[PDB]
Structure formats: C-alpha cells, structure tokens
Amino acid sequence: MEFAFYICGLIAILATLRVITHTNPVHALLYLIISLLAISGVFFSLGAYFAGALEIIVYAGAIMVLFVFVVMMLNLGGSEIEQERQWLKPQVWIGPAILSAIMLVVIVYAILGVNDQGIDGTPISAKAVGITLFGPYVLAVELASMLLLAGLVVAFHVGREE
Amino acid sequence: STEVIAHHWAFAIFLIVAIGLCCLMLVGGWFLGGRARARSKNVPFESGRLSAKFYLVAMFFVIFDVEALYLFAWSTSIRESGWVGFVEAAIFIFVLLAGLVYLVRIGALDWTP
Amino acid sequence: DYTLTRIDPRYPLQKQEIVTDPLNVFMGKLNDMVNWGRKNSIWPYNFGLSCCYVEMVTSFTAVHDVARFGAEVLRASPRQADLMVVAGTCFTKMAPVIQRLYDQMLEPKWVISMGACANSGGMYDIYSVVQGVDKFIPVDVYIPGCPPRPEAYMQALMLLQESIGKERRPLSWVVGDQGVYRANMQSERERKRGERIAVTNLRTPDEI
Amino acid sequence: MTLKELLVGFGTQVRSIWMIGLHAFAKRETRMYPEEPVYLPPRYRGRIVLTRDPDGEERC
Amino acid sequence: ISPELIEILLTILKAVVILLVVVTCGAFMSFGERRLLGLFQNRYGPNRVGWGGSLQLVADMIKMFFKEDWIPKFSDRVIFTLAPMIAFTSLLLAFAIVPVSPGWVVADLNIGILFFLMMAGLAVYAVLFAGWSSNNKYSLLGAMRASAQTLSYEVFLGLSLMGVVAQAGSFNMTDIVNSQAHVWNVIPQFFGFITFAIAGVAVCHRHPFDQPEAEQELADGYHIEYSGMKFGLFFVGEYIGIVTISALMVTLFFGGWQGPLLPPFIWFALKTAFFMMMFILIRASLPRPRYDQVMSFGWKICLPLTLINLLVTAAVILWQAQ
Amino acid sequence: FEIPVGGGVSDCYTRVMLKVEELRQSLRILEQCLNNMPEGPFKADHPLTTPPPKERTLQHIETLITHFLQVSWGPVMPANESFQMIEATKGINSYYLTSDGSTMSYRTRVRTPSFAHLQQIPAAIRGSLVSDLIVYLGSIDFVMSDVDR
Numbered sequence A: 001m002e003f004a005f006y007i008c009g010l011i012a013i014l015a016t017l018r019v020i021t022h023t024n025p026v027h028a029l030l031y032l033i034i035s036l037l038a039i040s041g042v043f044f045s046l047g048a049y050f051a052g053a054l055e056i057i058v059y060a061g062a063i064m065v066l067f068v069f070v071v072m073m074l075n076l077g078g079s080e081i082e083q084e085r086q087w088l089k090p091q092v093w094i095g096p097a098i099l100s101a102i103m104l105v106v107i108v109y110a111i112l113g114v115n116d117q118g119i120d121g122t123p124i125s126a127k128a129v130g131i132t133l134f135g136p137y138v139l140a141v142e143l144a145s146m147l148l149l150a151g152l153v154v155a156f157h158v159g160r161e162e
Numbered sequence B: 001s002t003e004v005i006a007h008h009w010a011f012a013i014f015l016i017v018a019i020g021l022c023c024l025m026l027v028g029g030w031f032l033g034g035r036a037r038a039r040s041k042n043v044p045f046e047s048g049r050l051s052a053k054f055y056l057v058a059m060f061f062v063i064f065d066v067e068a069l070y071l072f073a074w075s076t077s078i079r080e081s082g083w084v085g086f087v088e089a090a091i092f093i094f095v096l097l098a099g100l101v102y103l104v105r106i107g108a109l110d111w112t113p
Numbered sequence C: 001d002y003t004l005t006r007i008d009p010r011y012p013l014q015k016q017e018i019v020t021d022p023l024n025v026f027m028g029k030l031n032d033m034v035n036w037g038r039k040n041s042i043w044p045y046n047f048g049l050s051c052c053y054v055e056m057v058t059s060f061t062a063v064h065d066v067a068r069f070g071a072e073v074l075r076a077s078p079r080q081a082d083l084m085v086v087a088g089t090c091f092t093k094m095a096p097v098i099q100r101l102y103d104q105m106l107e108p109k110w111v112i113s114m115g116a117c118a119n120s121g122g123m124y125d126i127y128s129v130v131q132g133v134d135k136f137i138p139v140d141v142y143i144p145g146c147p148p149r150p151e152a153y154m155q156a157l158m159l160l161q162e163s164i165g166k167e168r169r170p171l172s173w174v175v176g177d178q179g180v181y182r183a184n185m186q187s188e189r190e191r192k193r194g195e196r197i198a199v200t201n202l203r204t205p206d207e208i
Numbered sequence D: 001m002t003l004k005e006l007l008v009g010f011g012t013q014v015r016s017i018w019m020i021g022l023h024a025f026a027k028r029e030t031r032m033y034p035e036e037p038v039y040l041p042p043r044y045r046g047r048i049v050l051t052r053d054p055d056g057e058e059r060c
Numbered sequence E: 001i002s003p004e005l006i007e008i009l010l011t012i013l014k015a016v017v018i019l020l021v022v023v024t025c026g027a028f029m030s031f032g033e034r035r036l037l038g039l040f041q042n043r044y045g046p047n048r049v050g051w052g053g054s055l056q057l058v059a060d061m062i063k064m065f066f067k068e069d070w071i072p073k074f075s076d077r078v079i080f081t082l083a084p085m086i087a088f089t090s091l092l093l094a095f096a097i098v099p100v101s102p103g104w105v106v107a108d109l110n111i112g113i114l115f116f117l118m119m120a121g122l123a124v125y126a127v128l129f130a131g132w133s134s135n136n137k138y139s140l141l142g143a144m145r146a147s148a149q150t151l152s153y154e155v156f157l158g159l160s161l162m163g164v165v166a167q168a169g170s171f172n173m174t175d176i177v178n179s180q181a182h183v184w185n186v187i188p189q190f191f192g193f194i195t196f197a198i199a200g201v202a203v204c205h206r207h208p209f210d211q212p213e214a215e216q217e218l219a220d221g222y223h224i225e226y227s228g229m230k231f232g233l234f235f236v237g238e239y240i241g242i243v244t245i246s247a248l249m250v251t252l253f254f255g256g257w258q259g260p261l262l263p264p265f266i267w268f269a270l271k272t273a274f275f276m277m278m279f280i281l282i283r284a285s286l287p288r289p290r291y292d293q294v295m296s297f298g299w300k301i302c303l304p305l306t307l308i309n310l311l312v313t314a315a316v317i318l319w320q321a322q
Numbered sequence F: 001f002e003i004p005v006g007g008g009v010s011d012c013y014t015r016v017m018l019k020v021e022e023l024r025q026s027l028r029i030l031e032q033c034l035n036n037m038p039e040g041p042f043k044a045d046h047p048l049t050t051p052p053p054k055e056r057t058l059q060h061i062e063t064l065i066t067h068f069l070q071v072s073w074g075p076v077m078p079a080n081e082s083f084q085m086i087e088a089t090k091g092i093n094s095y096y097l098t099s100d101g102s103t104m105s106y107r108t109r110v111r112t113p114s115f116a117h118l119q120q121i122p123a124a125i126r127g128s129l130v131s132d133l134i135v136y137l138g139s140i141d142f143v144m145s146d147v148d149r
Ligand SMILES: CCCCCCCCCCCCCCCCCC(=O)OC[C@H](COP(=O)(O)OCCN)OC(=O)CCCCCCCCCCCCCCCCC
Pocket: D001, D005, D006, D008, D009, D010, D013, D014, D017, E194, E196, E197, E198, E200, E201, E208, E245, E246, E249, E275, E278, E279, E282, E286, E289, E290, E293, E294, E296, E297
C-alpha cells in the first residue's frame, strides 16, 4: 500500500515535471499519460477504486485522446515553438518558478499543521459511490449533465469548419 | 488474508511477465537479422489541411463518455437506489437523448457534404 | 558453387564474386532452421501491373490454393512483404516506380520475374518497354509464359524455396559475415534434359 | 435509415453468414499441385520441342 | 517450506500457465485464421509445413524474428517502438481478468470490466501513436479515420456492458458468472448481446472495421511503415484481442464455464472457440460498409439502443424486485 | 438473346446488374450455339486465307507455296481502308486498318471504351468521397492496357 503510493507519486511528479519542460507536444502528452496512470495508481493505493478506474477510463482515456487528436489536427512540427525555446531562458521562468515555490512553501506549511491519524486504505466500492451519487447528490448529477450539455453545444458552435 | 495477497502477487507477476515478454520479443526481433542499405529505403511510402469533423467526433465521444460514466456509476446500484434513482436516471437519459437528437438534426453527426 | 553479393550505394549497386562454401555445426543448424522458416513463409507483394498479375491472382485463389505453401498473406506495403513478383511489363514510365518499390523492401528479399515481358521484354520490342526487369534489379527466379500458367508460378515458388533452403545469410547484424551467399544451383534445363529427351509420343491434337 | 431497413439489413447479413457456412459444408475445389498432376489437353501450347521422323531422323 | 508460500507459488504458476496458453492460442489463432478461411473458401489453407500445417506458425515466427527490424530516420523512434507494445499489452491485460475455471483466475478484481474498458482506451492510444509516429500523411489520415471509428464504438461499448452490470448487480466477474447459473445472459440482454458484439468487433480492428484492409488502394494504412517483429506484434495483438473479446463474451453473456455435464473448462473452451469461428464467419461473409455509414450506425443507432436497453433492464429489475 | 437496359441512372449497382444480365444472355447464346452447331469447313476457301489448311499444305504443292509466302513475307492485302467495331466485354472496341498494298498495315488504329470511361471519370466522381472513387473504379470494368495499348 505504501510502496505503490510513494512510487506512483514520485513518478507522477517526475512525469509532470517532464511535461511542463518539454517542446514536443506528443512527447509531453505521453508523459502526462504516464502521470495520469500514476495518479490512478495513487488512487488505487488509497482505496478509491472508482476514482482511479475512472481516471484511466476518461481522464487518461477520453480527454487526452482529444488532445492527441488536436495535435494531429494542427500537425505541430515545431513551428514557433522550438525555434526560440524562450521558456527555457532563466530570465523567463525563474520568476514564476520562485512564485510557485513560495506558494508551495505556504501551502505545505498550512498542510503540515493539521491533524492526521493516517489513511487506513479500506476500499470504497463503486456501489457505494453509485448509492450516494443518486441519493443526496441528485441535483449535482442532473446539473452536471446540464454542464456537459453546455460544453457540448458551445464546442459545436465554435469548432466548425464552414 | 493469504488468498488475496496470492491473487495480488499473481496479478503483479502477470503484469511483469507480459511486459517482459513483449519487450523480449521486440528485442529478439531487433537483435537478429542482417541489415541492408539503399537510397529509397529511408524515403517514405508515397508510392513513388484536413477537416475538423474528427475533432467534433472525438469531443462528442468525450462528453457522451462522461455521461456514460455517470450511467456506469448508476448501474451498479440500481436495486438499492429504488424507483427514485430510476426516475432520476430517466431524466438523465431523456436529456442525453434530447441532446443526441439535437446533434443528429443539425448535421453535427452527419459527416457527408 | 556460391556467389557473394553485398550492396553499397548504372543499377544495380552490387557486385557478385565467386566464393566457395564456408559452411560449427550449431551455426549450420541455426542457418538451416532460419532458412526453413524463411522459405515456409514467403510474403509476396501485391503489385498489379499487367496480365501476368491476373494469372498470379488466378494462382492465389481456391482452385489452385497457393496458400498451402504459406504464401498467401499478400501485403500491400513493400515493407511488410518479402518477395517481389514482377508480373508484368516494365514500361519506361513505370520503371522508376518499380525501382522505388524494390528499394523500399528490406533484406531478406527475393525477386520473381513473371512472363516474357518481365523476363526479356518479350513480344513488345517497342520504344516504351524496357527489355527485361534484370536491366535494373537483380532477379532470383524467372518464369517464361505469356502468361505462365498458375501451376508454373507455384513451380517457380518451389524453385525459390529450395534456392532459399541452400543459401547462407547472416543470423545477426552484430556478429558474423554480413555478405549474402547464394548457391549456384544446377539449372533446370540440363537437370530435366535427362527425361525431356526420352519423350517419344504425345496425344494427337484431334481429341480433347 | 428506418427500422424496416435495419431489420432487412440484419436479415441479409444473417443470410450471407448462413450461405458462407453452407459453402463451408461443401467439397474442396482445389487441385493439389504438385501431388496431383495437372491434366493438360493435347493441343495445349507449352514447351517447344523438335520431333523426329518415323525412320529415326530429325524432321526439320 | 510453508503452505502459504506454496499457495502463492501455485497461484503464480497458474497465472503464468494461463498467460502462456493465451499467447500460444493467439498465434494458433493466426494459424486458425488461415486454416478456417481456407475451410470456408472451399480450399485447404496451409497444410504442408508439418502435419496439416501445424508447423507453419513456427515458420512465420522464425521469419519475423530474423527479418530486419527497421525504424525510419524521419520517424520518431520512441513512439514507433511503443505503439505495438500497447496494442499487444492492452488486450492481453483485458484478458487478464477473465475467470476461465473455478479456482483458475488471475485477478478477482472488484472492477474487472472497467479495467477491460481502460485497456480499450489504451488500444485507441496504440493506434493513434502508430499513426502519428510514422511521419506519413497517408498513415496520418488512415489512423485518424480508424481512431475516430473506434471512439465512435467505444462510446457505447460500456453502455452495452451496463445491462449485464445491472442484471449482475456488481462489477466482479465471479458474480457475473454466478448470476447466469440459472438462465444465460444472452437471452435477456439480447440488445446488449448485439451491441457488445458490434463494439467488440469494431474496437479490435476486425473486419468489417479493419482500417488497413478497408482502403488498400489509397495506400493510407497506418501499418504501411511497420515491418519486422513490430508487424507481427500488431497481428499477435489483434488475434489475442479476438481471444480476449471472445472470452469476455463467454464470461459475460453465455454463462462462462457453467455447463451441465462436461468439465467447466471444456465448456468455456467450446464456447470461446465457437465465438472465434463466429469471428471467422463474420470476417469472410460481411462486406465492409462506408465510413459515414459506420459513423451513423455507431452514433444514431447503437448508442440509443444501449440507453433504451439499460432503461428497460432497470425497469424490469426493479419491477421484479417487489 | 436480349439486350438489357437500365432505368436511366448509371449507378454502380445498375452497371453490375446489367453485366449480370449480360452474363445470363451470354449463357443463352452459348446454349443456342451448343444445341445447333453447323458442320463444315473451319477455314475459308479464299486464296488469301492465312494460313491455308494444314493437310493440304502438307501434301499439295501450290497450297504449300501459298503457305510459304503467307507465313514468311505475309499476305498482300490490296491498298484499301477498313473499319470494324464490335461489342467487347467492356464496351465498343474498334479496329481501323489502312493498307498501302504491302504485307504490313500502313495504319492500325485501335479504339477502346476504357479510354472514354477513364476520361468520363472526373465528370461523375466530382463532389464525392474517396471510397465512392474506389467503388467507381471497381465498377467501370476497365483495364489500363485497354486505355494505353
Ligand atoms: C464476441 C462478440 C462478437 C462475436 C461475432 C458475432 C457478431 C459479429 C458482429 C459484426 C458487426 C458488424 C457491424 C456492421 C454494421 C454496419 C452498419 C452500416 O453502416 O450499414 C450501412 C447500411 C446502409 O446504410 P444506409 O444509410 O441505408 O445507406 C444508404 C446509402 N445507399 O445499412 C445496413 O446495411 C443496415 C443494417 C446494418 C447492420 C445491422 C446489424 C448487423 C449485426 C451484425 C450481424 C450479426 C449476425 C449474427 C451473428 C452471430 C449471432 C450468434
């Protein structure tokens, strides 16, 4: 339980670090596929079976398939991306990096001063999530379907060839 | 228990042996066999911008697959949720089918010109 | 009775030299089993050119069943195919395309010329026809006929099969001699002349 | 398409599958070269030879 | 020496035996593809390499091992090497949750068929990566068409599964195969039967949905640049996927290993092999539809059919449970 | 025998059923030929019949001479022009032969219908997809040797 969680977290952080510091869109997309697999391994270590299963079903199975589809649309062969590599110049990235660094310091200082007795890792089955989803969270289900409908119709209206 | 950790180790053994078998077969394919050189060997097979309906189909799949995951969560607890959950899933299905009918009737799913 | 050929970029860019047979019994058994596996699964290239291709696909059907020799996969890409069958006429416009399709194939590759057109230009001694496919690519097995009958194409397939069964190729590209060895087999003419001469009578052409 | 065309299409696919199975329960049409020799007609145009006189001389 | 370690080693040995049997029957299903097409087309197929052609597959394995393995210089190396790996391992791991016999299962997961669904997602990743990595616009458009097809059928694959999920009441394979102890699931979930059959055929790159044989004349197949053992990896992955979808179908709709008289593994093998022969019949019989027709049948027909099937299944289940 | 006709639209299916009905009519013609088959000569009695019948070549002298000068130099067609078009398997195929009185054809013109069909191709396939193009190519009944020759 501990080994899988820590290994998946380590390769997760390494993977997303390789995503944000890469120039090839397909290579970064593959790296974040690996990262999402790692987040789902973290979820399975924590006992959230439905959450990690769903991360590989749609988060690592549907949305980024559309991402690769758009990369296939554009055929990004490195035009106006790698010819300057301006995001690797230290005068560009050092400032925002120290911004996110002091933000991370503040966030982990807030996290480290809270109670904790550990996570027992008892599995939460998909039937309990289904019971709660169509129990006290029914408005969330229907209005999230409405949200998906709104995203669908706007993406249709904008993404047209004509 | 002993049985669950035995099944977990069997699954891990399946994982690593399948990975090693596929990688070993590719390694054997790449290692063996002599190599050739030619001029048009490294040119591609051409025997000597495309439309965004692919994106529209994929994004349609994304949205309908998220609504499908909602149905996946519902399906494992149909009996325990009672008739009220069935009714709520019925407005869910009605909204989904109304959206699909809308997409059909506007040529969004109609690929042909 | 062997020939050593190596390629290194007038076509073709290779030279043949007469070399004796060098053929460790472990390496010999490995070469025999490699050649057996190569000859029992020959993957031809689906290349539709002319009449002889129509007779090739007449060999490819159920009434002849070339599939029994493991030669029925018929890949449409030159990369996936092992054997190139030039079943047609080498026109001047189609000669560079034929050359490119031969170039895109990978070792090991073999060449079967089908018909008098691919053999020597044949009956078309004309301005727009290249007199033979051996002018620019090497050829392993020649078939005469206009078109050769399908069973003759299987006969050439077996001919290529025992040609492969007695040739030496490198097992790996990192250890050993990389040159391709091909046996100089005794030709079918003087081999079959022992029984072709003794033919005395044939059925008269007035019957079925 | 309507529902009628859908049922008609399903029926035609099932019919095609059934006829392919019926041909699968038939006899093989393959002439097994080279184990079975090819029957060729007497006037089949094949290998050119030079024949002989009945007296034993060459006829050319 | 300890009985717990003995049980663990026996379970590991059972899993390894199952995996080796699956890959060997995938290669033997390549051989059975050739032989059964020969039988169905009034011929014999390969029958001269060994007795009855049984040693042909060894010859293809030897040839594709000792053929030159070549990665194009213009192609990206890592994605080119990676795509057949995914196309193999995704459907192999999709098999990995099938219960063959009581006491013979690799992983008795609480999810199962969900893990099959995410391996199908990995399969669409495999075809997308194989298409993009070749650096060829023909393979680019061909694999885009194939990937859109498999998306358009993977959208309702899970919803066709959901009827059997509703009848079983859980996600585990053992509960699914034990809910068919009285009546086989092919009878109530007949719409689930046809929709899952169509989705499994389309998602596994099989006729009449196989893109590289859909248009060979445009030379736009995404396998066109793949050769050597990568090509054999692609076909072994496809045939292993045929075996996987057949075993999934047997354990889902046909009662799995449950049988009246024969041992359960014999019944499982017979039902799987019957569905493999059904694959041969639909490959050799069914003509290939046009691409927009495939889009229309995937979206406007199959998905509402799965939704209505799930609604009717829920109504019947709650109505029967007083 | 009967000549089939379409409804007025030249779909691929219409051409396919037209060729199927043509196959049935060809079976009818073959049955009619098999049932009542005339008995007589298999070559003409004209002196320009090339070659003459083989047995008369083999045991008569002027027939041997006619054979000798018709297989070696060739027959001397008088200087004239001739034309003949027939219904081939793919349409109408025509031969136009002009002779200058020699043993060779001064001009040999071969008209083939696949030439016209291949030129017709862009006027009908415009505004379609590529699978319709493959179906149209497979449903024309052409060959490249017909077009190019
Ligand atoms: C382990 C699981 C799998 C086991 C193997 C057995 C199952 C195999 C399933 C194979 C699935 C193949 C699906 C093919 C769908 C094609 C749909 C399509 O696009 O059809 C187009 C066609 C014409 O469409 P239209 O718009 O009318 O065109 C007008 C233009 N002139 O429209 C039509 O032709 C209409 C009819 C479309 C198809 C109807 C449904 C057919 C289902 C497949 C056949 C099943 C037969 C039985 C199998 C064994 C059962 C035990």
